[PDB]
Design a protein around this ligand. Structure first.
Ligand SMILES: Nc1ncnc2c1ncn2[C@@H]1O[C@H](CSCC[C@H](N)C(=O)O)[C@@H](O)[C@H]1O
Ligand SMILES: [Zn+2]
Lengths: 300, 76, 352, 179, 107, 176
């Protein structure tokens, strides 16, 4: 709880979408809405390149486990597989009839899930780029998809207050957790072992649902999240902090051991929509929307 | 002559038999004392299958020795 | 559920598959091919994981190590190599007599490998250096011996082409227990293969009179040297007479599968009762090569003319995984619901 | 796309069965046999006879996959065998919950509920020129509710009957008041 | 000198095995009759008998009856597809027909 | 006094002595054909069998109530739950009173002059709770709504076994 600013990643000319760390913990990537995906370092923000070659905008960018291969969630309704070391359009792949927001890889790096706006949650191929499976899941745009540790489960969040756990092999619904309120559930993700799911709902309250039983355990209070879909993370290096972006020009970091207001960071000038945590070190990213266009590296 | 029979599980029976007794008498005594049926009492003496129609004064059986009862399974 | 029933697809990806095996957890499948290629699939993702070129001549034997990071093979070229799943490089290679049957690690140590040559004696090796211990054979007349480690790793059972099973201690070569199999009336029969379970002491002997005998691993230790045990269970087919090719046990050592060398079928028995429970037919005119079994889940992987089939339970779904508040009944159910008609637990979330 | 916060975020629906695809004698139920001979084969046939899809008329509807002949059985309406005063609590309860009424009465004694418990005979729309009707039959003392047919029905055609407020039926013989 | 156990009990059947073996030996089919052939054939005959009596008992229950008369055997055979192909050129006495009126005859 | 035949629920076990009632599954509240209008009338509810898991709602319900009604549904019907006396009336939850034993003699009374009411849970002439107040003038049927097949009898004789103490009433040999 002694995080201070070190550097500032600048160069993005629109609302900064998301920034994510490499799995080896050495390359914090970046992107924006100006069809420019930059490649930055981790400890000083060192420039490498800027990935483009598109036709329309870009929403999100995923990884590879060896920190080499990439994919872009572009906004021309296509799927472009990219690369860190080269920067080449490896596979140009269509498949959707609307835009795509969330996309992820299984830990064995052979499948592409893509929670889209035309609601066809697909499972793609990496080696050949062929369509493999199809899930008629939701009647809303899919906000978050995620795999577990081994890779046998797929989670899915929606707008009508539903979360469904999907099967990798067979591909049918297994568990549906129900909520009387229906806010747009923004960002769900598994626990770092694969036995709990942390849910983010739009009533300014986070919830930690136990997986197999089916009830929640503890919540969070005191944050502002009503309009947008703000991400969240976990912390395993130091304490049990929970890092999330903020709307009121802050950084939302608290603990379930605390469950109260114990630490807030400050300095932003627009809504921080995406944060990211470092696996081995105490490095916290924080990127805001169009009125800031900068990234604030926090460091213990 | 109180010889012993230890099975593979680790249980030893205490049979206070005579040195000139039969096999079906031992079967009836085990039916009285345990409830286990006598359809599996294949006793092993130095690796050799003891025949069911025998007595104890036939195989030159040493007193207070150890035999072994091995369970068998059949039934559909 | 239990033992499989339905055909459930195939893997027609790489031609000319020949042999197959699983690891301890059943997440990988190594298959040698007709030109020195070892293709590894996945069952967690149902996709090809890694393809490693081994040699130019085919592969007829494979074995996983205990950690799962090392493979070993025995090709036609008398090559026994400790491979890598990360890099994929040959390390050790030295020639044997030209037919080789089977290789197998020690079930606790990845240092001891038990190679069974065809026209020789069993040779127990080391992998810290190039030592080799030729195990003793009683008859020394036919030189057709198959052998394997037991479940824990304490003993090695050996069998000859005359029906004489020996028990050697795994490190000092102590011939302490033996028997000759009571085949019919007077004549003796051959021994084709010896396999061991995953839970317990039971094992099976595949003879040449087309009868499979299921023994117990403790009656041999009870009887000692030159004893006469009898089998717990004798399993055969008398309609088609069915000369068998390959056998193994189920997950917890409860069921037995036994592929056929004439008609491309798979027969499954119980061990406790001992009755036939299901026959799994297939393509009518093929030829069978290998049978596998997934160690915690009912999946059988049968290689026949390069085609691997997977019998996998035919998952058929329903409602109420979508709408948990609804119960899709079948016929009418009458009731009234109730007889009166109107905490700080901190659990580690990152514990693996 | 991450910024255009818009409406249409909640619909308050129990079933998300509205899908992207929505791909809408010899048999014993068609013979002239007595009634329990047909009622036994009914439930084995009804799994492959019909299905539910996205109806253009009002929400969801029942769509066949095979040529139903004239005057045969199609499906049984079966759910909770409740009595006719818990229906009032459930009407006020799902008035508070906004969920519509699924209440067929077998006679003037008891009512079948199809909200918490039932089968795929819920999703049958209303019309004014229908092609199905109903009776109440007797199978071993108990009584049941069977949806018959009226004419030969082709693969893809929606099944409707008279339930007995503006409706989206649109038929020429409409009444525009369903009470 | 032991206890006699009939060959039906040893295989778990209900039809006799000794009578089938005698009727194969005394029926001029071949010279020599194997050991497993009457066991196989009694198993097949028991399977077909149970398969027809299941459907006949179901029809007899649906007509509010307790016993089985030849009408229920008629309905059971003629409604199944494969029993109808097996018993195709067979007249069952006191059996009747199936109800079937052509389409163009009723108004 | 003989029961009714057609203003009732026939699926219950109106037993074959014409003086003893046995219930079934569900609160199918059978109601007799002798409802109070004015004056003073009382009878008993004699329990001869009471198994466990047998809640017996006893009270007074109008002709406006359903034949299948729960006794305690509306303003026109009272309730008295066996579990902690938690009565329910106009959908109101109130943990109020005590329970009742096995094989006792039950029976309730109301006094409606030609008004002011005397509505107290009457068990063995002992107070069990002041129930409610200020009803309207009307008819109230003898309500038998049982949960299981508990065989209970009923006393129509003027020689009551447990009446309320010092009760002004009339003998039951004049209504039927
Ligand atoms: N043809 C029709 N036009 C307008 N409303 C209809 C209709 N048929 C049924 N309804 C209404 O819809 C309810 C039946 S349920 C309708 C189908 C399904 N529940 C769905 O929408 O997904 C009834 O309450 C009825 O009032
Ligand atoms: Zn209409």
């Amino acid at each position: 709880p002694n995080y201070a600013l070190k550097f500032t990643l600048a160069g993005h000319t629109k609302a900064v979408s998301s920034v994510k760390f490499s799995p080896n913990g050495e390359w914090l990537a970046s992107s924006s809405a100006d069809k420019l995906i930059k490649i930055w370092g981790a400890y000083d923000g060192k420039f490498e390149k800027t990935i483009s070659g598109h036709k329309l905008g870009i929403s999100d960018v995923a990884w590879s486990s060896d920190s080499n291969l990439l994919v872009s969630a572009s906004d021309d309704k296509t799927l472009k597989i990219w690369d860190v070391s080269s920067g080449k359009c490896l596979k140009t792949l269509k498949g959707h009839s609307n835009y795509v927001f969330c996309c992820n890889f299984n830990p064995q790096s052979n499948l592409i899930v893509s929670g889209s706006f035309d609601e066809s949650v697909r499972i793609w191929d990496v080696k050949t780029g062929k369509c493999l499976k199809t899930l008629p899941a939701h009647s809303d745009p899919v906000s978050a998809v995620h795999f577990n540790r081994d890779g046998s489960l797929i989670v899915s969040s929606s707008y009508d207050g539903l979360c469904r756990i999907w099967d990798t092999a067979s591909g049918q619904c297994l568990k549906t957790l129900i909520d009387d309120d229906n806010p747009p559930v923004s960002f769900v993700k598994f626990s770092p072992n694969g036995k709990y799911i942390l849910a983010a709902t739009l009533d300014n309250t986070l919830k930690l649902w136990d997986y197999s039983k089916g009830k929640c355990l503890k919540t969070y209070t005191g944050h502002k999240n009503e309009k947008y879909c703000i991400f969240a993370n976990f912390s395993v290096t130091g304490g049990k902090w929970i890092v999330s972006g903020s709307e009121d020009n802050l950084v939302y970091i608290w603990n379930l051991q605390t469950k109260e207001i114990v630490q807030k960071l400050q300095g932003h000038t627009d809504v921080v929509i995406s944060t990211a945590c470092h696996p081995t070190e105490n490095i916290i990213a924080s990127a805001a929307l169009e009125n800031d266009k900068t990234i604030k590296l926090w460091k213990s | 002559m109180q010889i012993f029979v230890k099975t593979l599980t680790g249980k030893t029976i205490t049979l206070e038999v005579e040195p000139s007794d039969t096999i079906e008498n031992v079967k009836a005594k085990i039916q009285d004392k345990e409830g286990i049926p006598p359809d599996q009492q294949r006793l092993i003496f130095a690796g050799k299958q003891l025949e069911d129609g025998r007595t104890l004064s036939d195989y030159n059986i040493q007193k207070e020795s150890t035999l072994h009862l091995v369970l068998r399974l059949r039934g559909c | 559920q239990n033992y499989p029933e339905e055909a459930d697809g195939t893997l027609d990806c790489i031609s000319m598959a020949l042999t197959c095996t699983f690891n301890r957890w059943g997440t990988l499948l190594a298959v040698g091919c007709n030109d020195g290629r070892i293709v590894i699939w996945d069952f967690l993702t149902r996709g090809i994981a890694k393809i490693i070129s081994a040699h130019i001549h085919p592969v007829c034997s494979l074995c996983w190590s205990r950690d799962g990071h090392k493979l070993v093979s025995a090709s036609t070229d008398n090559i026994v190599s400790q491979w890598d799943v990360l890099s994929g490089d040959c390390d050790q290679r030295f020639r044997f007599p030209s037919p080789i049957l089977k290789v197998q690690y020690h079930p606790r140590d990845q240092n001891k490998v038990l190679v069974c040559p065809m026209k020789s004696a069993p040779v127990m090796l080391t992998l810290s250096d190039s030592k080799h211990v030729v195990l003793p054979v009683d008859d020394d007349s036919d030189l057709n011996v198959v052998a394997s480690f037991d479940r824990r790793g304490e003993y090695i059972y050996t069998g000859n082409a005359k029906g004489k099973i020996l028990v050697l201690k795994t490190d000092s070569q102590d011939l302490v227990a033996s028997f000759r199999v009571t085949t019919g009336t007077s004549n003796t029969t051959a021994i084709k293969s010896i396999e061991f379970a995953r839970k317990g002491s039971c094992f099976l002997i595949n003879t040449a009179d087309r009868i499979i005998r299921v023994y117990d691993g403790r009656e041999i230790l009870t009887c000692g040297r030159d004893g006469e045990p009898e089998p717990m269970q004798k399993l055969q087919d008398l309609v088609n007479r069915t000369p068998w090719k390959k056998c193994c046990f189920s997950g917890d050592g409860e069921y037995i599968v036994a592929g056929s060398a004439r008609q491309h079928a798979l027969y499954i028995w119980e061990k406790s009762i001992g009755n036939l429970v299901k026959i799994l037919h297939g393509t009518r005119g093929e030829l069978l090569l290998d049978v596998a079994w997934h160690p915690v889940r009912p999946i059988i992987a049968s290689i026949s003319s390069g085609v691997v089939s997977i019998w996998a339970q035919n998952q058929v779904e329903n409602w109420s995984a979508f709408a948990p508040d609804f119960k899709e009944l079948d016929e009418n159910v009458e009731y009234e619901e109730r007889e009166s008609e109107f905490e700080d637990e901190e659990v580690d979330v990152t514990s693996v | 796309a991450r910024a255009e916060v818009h409406l249409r975020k909640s619909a308050f629906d129990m079933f998300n069965f509205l899908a992207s695809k929505h791909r809408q004698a010899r048999r014993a139920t068609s013979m002239d046999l007595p009634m329990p001979m047909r009622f036994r084969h009914l439930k084995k046939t009804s799994k492959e006879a019909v299905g539910v899809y996205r109806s253009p008329i009002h929400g969801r509807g029942l769509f066949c996959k095979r040529n139903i002949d004239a005057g045969e059985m199609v499906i049984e309406y079966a759910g909770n065998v409740i009595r006719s005063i818990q229906t009032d609590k459930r009407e006020k309860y799902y008035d508070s919950k906004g969920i519509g009424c699924y209440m067929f009465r077998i006679d003037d004694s008891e009512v079948v509920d199809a909200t918490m418990h039932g089968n795929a005979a819920r999703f049958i729309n209303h019309s004014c020129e229908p092609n199905c009707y109903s009776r109440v039959i007797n199978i071993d003392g108990q009584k049941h509710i069977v949806i018959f047919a009226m004419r030969k029905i082709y693969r893809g055609e929606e099944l409707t009957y008279d339930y007995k407020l503006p409706c989206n039926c649109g038929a020429k013989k409409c009444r525009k008041f369903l009470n | 000198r032991a206890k006699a156990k009939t060959r039906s009990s040893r295989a778990g059947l209900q039809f006799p095995v000794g009578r089938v073996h005698r009727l194969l030996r005394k029926g001029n089919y071949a010279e020599r009759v194997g050991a497993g052939a009457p066991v196989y054939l009694a198993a097949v005959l028991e399977y077909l008998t149970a398969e027809i009596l299941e459907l006949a008992g179901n029809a007899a229950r649906d007509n509010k009856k307790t016993r089985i008369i030849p009408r229920h055997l008629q309905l059971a055979v003629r409604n199944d597809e494969e029993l109808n192909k097996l018993l195709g050129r067979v007249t069952i006495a006191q059996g009747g027909v199936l109800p079937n009126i052509q389409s163009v005859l009723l108004p | 006094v003989l029961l009714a035949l057609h203003d009732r629920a026939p699926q219950l076990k109106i037993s074959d002595d014409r003086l003893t009632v046995v219930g079934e599954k569900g609160y199918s509240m059978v109601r007799a054909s002798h409802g109070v209008r004015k004056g003073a009338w009382y009878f008993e509810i004699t329990v001869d069998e009471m198994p466990p898991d047998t809640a017996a709602r006893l009270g007074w319900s109008q002709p406006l109530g359903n034949l299948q009604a729960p006794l305690g549904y509306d303003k026109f019907s009272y309730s008295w739950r066996s579990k902690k006396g938690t009565k329910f009336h106009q959908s109101i939850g109130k943990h109020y009173s005590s329970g009742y034993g096995q094989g006792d003699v039950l029976g309730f009374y109301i006094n409606l002059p030609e008004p002011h009411s005397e509505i107290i849970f009457y068990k063995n002439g002992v107070n069990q709770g002041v129930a409610y107040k200020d009803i309207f003038e009307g008819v109230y049927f003898p309500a038998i709504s049982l949960y299981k097949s508990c065989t209970v009898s009923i006393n129509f004789g003027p020689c009551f076994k447990y009446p309320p103490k010092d009760l002004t009433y009339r003998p039951m040999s004049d209504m039927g």
